[PDB]
Design a protein around this ligand. Structure first.
Ligand SMILES: Nc1ncnc2c1ncn2[C@@H]1O[C@H](COP(=O)(O)OP(=O)(O)OP(=O)(O)O)[C@@H](O)[C@H]1O
Ligand SMILES: Nc1ncnc2c1ncn2[C@@H]1O[C@H](COP(=O)(O)OP(=O)(O)OP(=O)(O)O)[C@@H](O)[C@H]1O
Ligand SMILES: [Zn+2]
Ligand SMILES: [Zn+2]
Lengths: 87, 458, 241
């Protein structure tokens, strides 16, 4: 009680890092989807119009490879921004 | 045709999701085989060359095949876990953000702390038309409307949640709907929710286990440029074997205390270095030939490095490695210096490290014993002691396996979730309403069927 | 077989000194201190081998020149010019060294990689010499403590609960020496063993009604005749007291 009263008497009257990470995420994911959200997909799929399980599996693997490369670019961008804000 | 390519893709996804763990084991085995082969890897000497030295001569192609297999298995171990554990992560995060919207007004009344990556990133998924894609509660937006619109405004909360105002009323007045074919061009492109996929990819990239798998794949790729990068995959035993994790928890349980002990050791050795540099400089000659002295404590940095690097590793401390003090005027002072260094650094601080590890062992064992005792002496749901039920023979076992089974409660929650709301009975409707309100008063607490009907039953 | 071989070579009789472990009860507590966590000990040794292999890879890729173990410069004796030799050198010398591999490889002062090799030696000493060996010591100490705790738990359970019915000692202790009387006269497990022997050795045609009932449930392996949460005192509590 004494120290509380004394304290009352005497009392008289990260963000950059998270923003850089968010920007890196947005930029890298936008770059990833800029090649999957356009109408050229028709002219690329004209060749794969045939059934060709081999080509379907190839494209299925390529999608995940593209995702992995996008994550690698995102991590590189995060490191670049973190060093830049260090300096 | 598209309905068949989707089926084939789903078959591949299911195969990888089923075989995620087996193939993680396969990757570990292939890494072990690669490193065992690398154990026979010599240097030839000009620029030195690294070459396999083997009488058999065929483990170079074997190593190449194993490296290719390891890279393929790592890629597949990404595709799996993407088909398997990513949905669970997405479900958990969707549930968390939906319940923080409903029960906390996170983006209505509170707003994120501006330093939380999760809170700041989750703002994207609110406006998406497919927000609760994995979470079962598809009415979270309507519930948020009901809870917060009357005070914070129908229109503004609808803008926040990305909902439509007049389209629903116009459709109710007149349906005005035309058929759509997904086999047409741009149909899938229009159907896919770009913003939701953005948020999902951000969550996946922020996920720790996915980052670890990506690092595993990157190291496997680098292993082709240099075969010794495959040694980095031997660190996967910690994350692969449960049994090693007890031994490693013996170290990581008091990791903060271990780091602080190392820092305290550094500070103490720095104090000893200051004393030696100010009083005992002449004893730090480490050259056998008197022609050229090699003074190790003529500089603060060199003297501190000498101490930290030599005295700590020495069995008897710094006195094992500095000049004998006999016959000197400072003989007693340097004897005290050496004895105190040996006692405080070599004997006590290392004992602190050993005691931290031993105490971690004991604490983990005690925690497991406490879990066992609590589970064997109290019911997990109601919390009544085992003796009351044991008044009837096998009473506690019967009560915990037939009456208050947590597995049965989980099954009931699953049954309610999968059952149509319009088909609920009275008790089911009551429990469902309190579950949606997140009120846990229907769980018995200190009471049970036997306690309430004790007179009639017995 | 070892005794027979001892006649061909008298030193095969030394193999019979291992019989002390299986002959003396007292040595078995000390040996259980080791065998209680034997799987964890083996896994710790394997983890040490893996860590030393990683250190060997690093040294072979960056610190080869420091592994000359020949005093004469005429003929070098390079111990880490091969993966297998470098790994054997590490596992055999650095682990047994008090200060780690740095006690036995060349001094790094004046080299471009001085800081890197200092970090190498310090981390080797901390992780291998200090921590993993501490893990072994802690495993042994924890085995001691766990065995002692198990014995204490056995003692406490036997002193606080009846072995047959499981009723706590306080209820019987309401009567002086009640728990002792109940556990030595009423619910004696030795008495139950004697009763089982008596039933087995007694002719089935001479069984009484209670004996026939217990014998039938014993042959059916139904253990409902053992009191569980009930006793003579509990059932006749009103009349007896
Ligand atoms: N509400 C409860 N539901 C279930 N078990 C309970 C509950 N309350 C206490 N228990 C006790 O918890 C223990 C559950 O045993 P446990 O889960 O270890 O066995 P299991 O189902 O055979 O499988 P596992 O050993 O693999 O977990 C039992 O001793 C049981 O009496
Ligand atoms: N059903 C039971 N039958 C016998 N003892 C019981 C029973 N329930 C509890 N106990 C307790 O177990 C203990 C048995 O003692 P203990 O067997 O150690 O002694 P002992 O017969 O003299 O021989 P020893 O010490 O060599 O085993 C006593 O403390 C007794 O109260
Ligand atoms: Zn219960
Ligand atoms: Zn009893």
């Amino acid at each position: 009680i004494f120290e509380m009263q004394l304290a009352a008497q005497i009392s008289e009257s990260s963000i950059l890092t998270v923003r850089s990470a968010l920007f890196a995420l947005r930029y890298n994911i936008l770059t990833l989807m800029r090649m999957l959200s356009l109408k050229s997909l028709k002219k690329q799929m004209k060749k794969v119009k045939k059934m060709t399980v081999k080509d379907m599996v190839t494209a299925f693997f390529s999608s995940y490879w593209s995702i992995f490369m996008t994550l690698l670019h995102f991590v590189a961008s995060v490191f670049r921004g973190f060093f830049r804000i260090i300096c | 045709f598209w309905k068949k390519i989707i089926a084939y893709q789903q078959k591949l996804l299911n195969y990888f999701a089923r075989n995620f763990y087996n193939m993680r084991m396969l990757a570990l085995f292939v890494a072990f085989a690669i490193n065992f082969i690398l154990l026979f890897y010599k240097v030839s000497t000009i620029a030195v060359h690294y070459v396999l030295e083997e009488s058999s001569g065929y483990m170079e192609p074997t190593l190449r095949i194993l490296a290719i297999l390891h890279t393929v298995i790592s890629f597949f171990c990404i595709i799996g876990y993407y088909c398997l554990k990513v949905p669970l992560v997405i479900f958990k995060r969707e549930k968390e953000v939906a319940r923080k919207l409903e029960f906390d007004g996170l983006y209505i009344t509170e707003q994120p702390s501006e330093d939380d990556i999760k809170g700041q990133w989750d703002r994207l998924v609110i406006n998406t038309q497919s927000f609760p894609n994995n979470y079962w509660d598809k009415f979270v937006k309507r519930k948020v409307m009901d809870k917060y619109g009357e005070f914070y405004g129908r229109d503004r909360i609808s803008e926040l949640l990305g909902m439509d105002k007049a389209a629903l009323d116009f459709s109710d007045a007149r349906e005005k709907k035309k058929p759509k074919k997904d086999s047409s061009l741009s149909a899938v492109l229009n159907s896919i929710d770009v913003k939701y996929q953005m948020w999902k990819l951000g969550v996946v990239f922020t996920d720790n286990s996915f980052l670890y798998l990506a690092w595993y794949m990157t190291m496997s790729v680098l292993g082709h440029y240099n075969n010794f990068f495959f040694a980095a995959h031997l660190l996967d035993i910690a994350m692969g074997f449960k049994t090693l994790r007890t031994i490693l928890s013996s170290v990581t349980h008091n990791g903060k205390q271990l780091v602080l002990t190392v820092g305290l050791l550094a500070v103490v050795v720095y104090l000893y270095t200051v004393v030696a540099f100010n009083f005992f400089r002449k004893f730090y000659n480490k050259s056998e030939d008197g022609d050229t002295p090699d003074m190790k404590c003529d500089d603060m940095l060199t003297c501190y490095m000498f101490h930290m690097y030599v005295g700590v590793r020495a069995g008897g401390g710094i006195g094992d490695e500095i000049e004998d003090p006999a016959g000197d005027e400072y003989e007693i002072y340097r004897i005290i210096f050496d004895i105190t260094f040996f006692f405080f650094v070599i004997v006590i601080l290392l004992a602190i490290i050993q005691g931290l590890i031993i105490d971690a062992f004991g604490e983990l064992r005690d925690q497991q014993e406490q879990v066992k005792e609590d589970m064997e002496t109290k019911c997990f749901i109601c919390g009544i002691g085992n003796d009351y039920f044991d008044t009837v023979p096998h009473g506690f076992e019967t009560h915990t396996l037939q009456e208050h089974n947590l597995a049965n409660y989980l099954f009931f929650l699953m049954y309610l979730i999968n059952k149509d709301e319009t088909e609920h009975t009275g008790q089911e409707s009551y429990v469902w309403k309190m579950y949606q309100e997140r009120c846990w008063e229907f769980f018995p607490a200190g009471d049970c069927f036997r306690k309430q009907y004790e007179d009639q039953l017995n």
